[PDB]
Amino acid sequence: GSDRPPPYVAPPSYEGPHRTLGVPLPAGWEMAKTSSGQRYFLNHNDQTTTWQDPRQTLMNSASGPLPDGWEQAMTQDGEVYYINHKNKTTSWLDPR
């Protein structure tokens, strides 16, 4: 299949189980792991990293929610994706 580019690697299909985050991470944030598997967070908005769950950035207050009908979830490998229940789709792109 070298004549075609590598296939798109999609998020988990809409139908099936999802490890949803009850409260989504704020837009522009990412979760990662250290080499020993310690969880930490990246704020791409102000280009910082921190141990503290956003749910040097001051995060007192509630952040922008997903639009109605959407949820944030995480793959087994820790990759965040977005579930749109309105049209039964999933996407790597944050709709906020």
Which structural technique was applied? Answer: X-ray
Cβ proximity of 72 and 79 under 8 Å:
no
Residue type at 40? Y
Are 53 and 41 in contact by the 8 Å Cβ rule? The answer is: yes
Domain ranges for the chain: 22-54, 60-96
Sheet of strand 39-43, all strands in order from the earlier edge strand to the far edge = 29-33, 39-43, 48-50
Q: Give the torsion sign (CA, 45, 23, 54, 33).
A: negative
* Breaks (C–N over 2.5 Å) after residues, the chain: 55
